[PDB]
Each structure stands twice: as C-alpha cells, then as structure tokens.
C-alpha cells in the first residue's frame, strides 16, 4: 500500500565518538584533587546479540589519561622550592666506609658554598651524592644537567603513591565494555555491556615490565599494533602475578638547611652501618613457569618449529635500558638481566634471582627537554613489595631467513602501559532520533 514516513524519538542507536571523560576517585600528586566521589557500585547492563567492534590502538581514552597525568605531575611542583643556587663548583672526593662496594666512585663526599637567609652571608656545607647525580667539570663537579635545565625540589609532604581513578561519561554518551576473553584488543566483541564508568585504574610508572595491573582471565594474552612489523612493541598480559621484593638496605639519614628567606633544602647525611647495593628478589621457579607460558603462546602466532630467545637491551639511555620503579619516593633502575637470559628449543630452557639496582636523585619522568626534578632523600631503610602483571617485548630480529627469533624488553613510551587497562573500553554517542515506513495518516 502507500507507506508513510514516521518519526521515533528515544531510539537505541549509537555512533563512534570522542568526548572528554571526567575522573572520579575514592598530600598526594594524583588526580584526586580534581576528581569527584565515585559510584561505589557502577552499573552494568549486558546487551544480548551485540557484536560491536573495538580497536584499542586508536582509543582516544588513552590520550585523555596521558594529558591528565602530565598536568597533575606539574601541578604538584608549582609551590615547591627552586634549587637554582645549587649550580656551583661542588668539589668532591671518594666516600670511604665499611662497604661491599659498587662501581668505584658510586658515592661521593662533596662540599660547597651556599647562601643564607641574609644575602650578606654565606655558609659552607657538605653532603653525599650518587655518581649519577654529578658530572666532572674537567676534583671539581657539576650537578647533572646544570647546563640544560632548572631543577625543582619535590615537596616532602607530597606522596607519589597511586590512587585508583575512574572515568565517567557526560550526558548523551555511554561507555561500552568488551566482556570477551582471549581478546587481542581488535575486531568484533561477541559480548558487550554498557557502563556509566570504568573500573578504577591506578597510574603506574614503569619500564620493561607492567606492575600492579589487571590479570588475564584464563591464559596469557599477546597483542601488538602490527605483528608483522618488528618495530612495534608487543604487549603481554599475564594470567598470574609474579611477586617481586625490592629494597634499599642502606640506613640513610636526612639533614636540611635554610636557603634564602623563603625556602629550605634537604640532603643525604651520613649513612649509618654497612653500605650495600640496592636490589630486587624474584622466585626463579615462578619466573621459569611464567616464561614457559609466554613461549607457548608466542608459538601460536609465530608458528611451531621456532627457537625462542630472550636477551637484554643492546643499548640506549639508562631510562629505557633498565627497569624503572618509583617506590618509597626513591627512583630505582634495575638491570633485569637473568630474567631475560634464555634459549627455548625443546619447550624447556637449553632459589631466588637477585637483580642489581641503582638510585638517582635527579630525574626527568616524562622525558621532556628542559625539565628536571630533585627528589628529597628518604630517611631509613626502604622495602617495597609489588607484583609483575605483564611484559613489554620487542623483536630484534624480524627473521624470516632462519628458524630463530630473539626478543628484548621495550620501553620509553608510557602510552603502552595505559593501553593495557583501557583496551576493553569504547566511547559512543547516543543518537535518539530515527525514522520508519509504517503506514499512517494525519488530518489537516
């Protein structure tokens, strides 16, 4: 018959869209200052017969999280003390003590001329530094990067401890969540739910391994932006934790001086007791099981009859060639060798593992040119317990001309850490208006 246009409003149709999401949380550097109280029990509606496509590599939510984190880090340093007066001749000598030693010269005993509350007077002080914190002028020393940037002291009252952050949609928008398992972050998701907000995600800063993240539901999941391109990082999510115990055994003390009328500076004082190298302990047997699971899953993509090898990074900056921690307010760099030293031919390698670590007080967390922060030293012995929840691997081969392939730890790009948690979420815009042919007529 004669079909007619009809109009419906409230129609359950959505489109791909990008919009700002807002944070929620349950002193501290993190977002909780900008955030609002959370929904203690976010609602989830399961949708049957929905096959909505997800693509984590294009997900805008990653960029929003990144920008919030950069702004927060900087915001916490705005009221804090400037250390510009510290760029001085800084003469130093060897620390002599009861030591197990380290690289020679790792600790230095330095003395220098500082300003006082009155500009009319100067004072002489001494302090201990790590070799990484200083460079030779030509003995005479200079604080590292005095030739590149101003250094700001972190405020001692501000914790760096992570706070879980939830993101919530604005009105007219909804967040879809993939419920599938063994999902590689792309393609159609067979089961989809709708949520007002995301699960809480802790900010974590680390390299080569992922800490305090979510676990895979059943089996280890391997994904990458382009598996055929060796340049791309491969992310591996574990279905089990591996516990790691890290420590800073030295009994450091903290001393302070007033600089100028408006500020004060904290520095490392005499160290009490034997001086020992920082280190981390992991179970060998647990790690061995973990590698066996990763290798088995790699073969599913790279095929059978391959030899899988692991090796340490061949070179590049200390910031990316080593594992990084921020714990206790101290920054650790660890070699990781002995975790990644193996060859797997016969589904087997052809107590604890102790890794060496180093401490640096002057850092640049986001790798920005012209920026620097000085952490104040933390008094007493520091112990940290955390769990490894994933790995970042790279191919140093791309080999097609052999039966072998070798993997090395990746790093230097923070976006890959956040992608491991946000891959399940997609943002869509709701469009309530639509039309249909159903017959009807109106009087005029």
């Amino acid at each position: 018959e004669n079909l007619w246009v009809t109009v419906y409003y409230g129609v359950p149709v959505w489109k791909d869209a990008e919009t700002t999401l807002f944070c929620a949380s349950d002193h501290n550097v993190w977002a909780t200052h900008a955030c609002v109280p959370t929904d203690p029990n976010p609602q989830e509606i399961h949708l049957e017969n929905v096959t909505e496509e997800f693509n984590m590599w294009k997900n805008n939510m990653v960029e929003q999280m990144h920008e919030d984190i950069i702004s927060l880090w900087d915001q916490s340093l705005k009221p804090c003390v400037k250390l510009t007066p510290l760029c001085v001749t800084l003469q130093c000598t060897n620390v002599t003590n009861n030591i197990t030693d380290d690289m020679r010269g790792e600790l230095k005993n330095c003395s220098f001329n500082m300003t006082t509350e009155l500009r009319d007077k100067k004072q002489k002080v001494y302090s201990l530094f790590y070799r990484l914190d200083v460079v030779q002028i030509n003995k005479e020393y200079r604080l590292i990067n005095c030739n590149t940037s101003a250094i700001t002291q972190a405020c001692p009252k501000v914790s760096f401890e992570p706070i879980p952050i939830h993101y919530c949609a604005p009105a007219g928008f909804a967040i879809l969540k993939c419920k599938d398992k063994k999902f590689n972050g792309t393609g159609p998701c067979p089961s989809v739910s709708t949520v007002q907000c995301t699960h809480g995600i802790k900010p974590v800063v680390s390299t080569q391994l992922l800490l305090n993240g979510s676990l895979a539901e059943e089996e280890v999941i391997i994904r990458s932006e382009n598996i055929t391109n060796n340049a791309k990082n491969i992310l591996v999510q574990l279905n089990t934790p591996v516990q790691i115990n890290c420590t800073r055994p030295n009994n450091n003390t903290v001393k302070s001086i007033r600089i100028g009328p408006g500020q004060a500076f904290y520095y490392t004082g005499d160290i009490i007791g034997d001086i020992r190298q920082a280190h981390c302990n992991v179970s060998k047997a647990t790690w061995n099981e973990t590698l066996g699971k990763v290798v088995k899953q790699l073969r599913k993509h790279f095929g059978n009859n391959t030899i899988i090898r692991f090796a340490q990074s061949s070179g590049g900056d200390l910031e990316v060639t080593t594992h990084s921690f921020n714990c206790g307010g101290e920054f650790f760099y660890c070699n990781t060798s002995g975790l990644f030293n193996s060859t797997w031919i016969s589904n087997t390698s052809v107590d604890s593992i102790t890794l060496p670590c180093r401490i640096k007080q002057i850092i640049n967390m986001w790798q920005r040119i012209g920026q620097a922060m000085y952490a104040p030293p933390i008094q007493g012995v520091i112990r940290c317990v955390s769990n490894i929840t994933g790995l970042i691997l790279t191919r140093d081969g791309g080999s097609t001309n052999s039966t072998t392939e070798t993997f090395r730890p990746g790093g230097g790009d923070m976006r890959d850490n956040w992608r491991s948690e946000l891959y399940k979420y997609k943002v869509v815009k709701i469009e309530p208006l639509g039309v249909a042919p159903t017959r009807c007529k109106r009087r005029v």
Partner: antibody
Amino acid sequence: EVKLEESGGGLVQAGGSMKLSCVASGFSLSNYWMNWVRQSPEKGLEWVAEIRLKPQNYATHYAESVKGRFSISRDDSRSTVYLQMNNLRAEDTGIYYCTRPGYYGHYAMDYWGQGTSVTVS
Amino acid sequence: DIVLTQSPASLAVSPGQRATISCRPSESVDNYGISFMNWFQQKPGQPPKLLIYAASNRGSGVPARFTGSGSGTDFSLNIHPMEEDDIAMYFCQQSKEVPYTFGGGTKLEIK
C-alpha cells in the same frame, strides 16, 4: 589424528604448468608451517619449498633447482596449501609430498602425506 | 648449500649383526650446543618415516634397536640386531639451515 591429502598430479607436457594441492586435517593450518619435498630413485629425497606464517609476512623459500619456476601459497581460511609450477622440465619428474615440520626446535619431517605422481614429457 | 656425504651406498648384513651407516656434512650441523642431523627410513610405495632426530633422539614409535651417534661433522646410524623388517632405504638430513639438504641414500639388505 593428523592427515595430509595430495591432489592435482598427472602427466603434463614439458614447458607446461600445473597446480598441486594439499588438504590439511586434524590441526590448525594457520599456526604451524608447511613444506614440500620431492623424490626420484635417480636422486633420492630433495627439498623444494617452504612457506612462513603471517608475522613473517608469509615469506617463502625455494631450492635453487626449482626457484623461479615454482611458487608456494596457502589459504588459511580453507585449510589448504598449494604448490604452483610452470616452465616444467623432464628433470622435475618425481613423487611430490606435502609435509609437516613436527618436533619443535628439532625441525624434521615428522608427517607426510601419501604423495602424488608428477610426470613431465 | 651444505653438502652431505653418506656411505656405504649399500650394505648386506646378516641377521643378528650390527649395521652402520655413516654421514659426513661439509659444514657442522651443530647449533646452540645441539646437533641438527636427522635420519629417515623408507620402504617402496611409502613416504619416508622419521627415524632419528637431533642425531640421538629416536623418533616417536621407533624401536630401541635404532641408535643415533656423533657430533660436529661426523655422524652415524647404528642398527642392532639386524632383522628382515629393517630392509629399507636410509637417508641423512641437515635441518640447521635453509635450504635443508639430503643425499647419498643407502640401501640396507639381509645377508
């Protein structure tokens, strides 16, 4: 139970062309690796072709004796492997087999199909 | 290519005696401390069956009488006791590199 079945063999005039096929069964073709070999009493066993998986960009390798006259390709969605050949010579006469690498690390032809006769004249 | 030499071309062995077949690669087959030499057994009308892998490991389903040996560029297959069921062509293979190579197949017979 892993099985391979060859087809497409038979007598072909020299300088001509033909396609051989192998049907995979009992395993996922997409996650393994495939190889072709040939045999004649005149020469014994000879390896002729290999095909890689997607991360390897489906790269292929050929023996110098067959290179440029033979080509290997696969269809992961149909569980099949194909060996294309042209510019055939009498020297190519022999029994062709679809094979599997088997044991990991210790690459070896652990599984073979029945094979098929190819004759060139 | 890496050339394999295999000998004897043929041998006749009485039942209950040990048979040996040698194989000598032009280049070492070894890698990562492990040999990559393989051996096959074949009977007429049938595809070859993997006999030995990694120069020492019997293939699955292979009888104890078949033993691999050697390292570097010197390998051999040792069969004992000889039985009529063992009459077959035998081949050595180098799996270490592409192209993989075969050659010099040997005929083993009952005396």
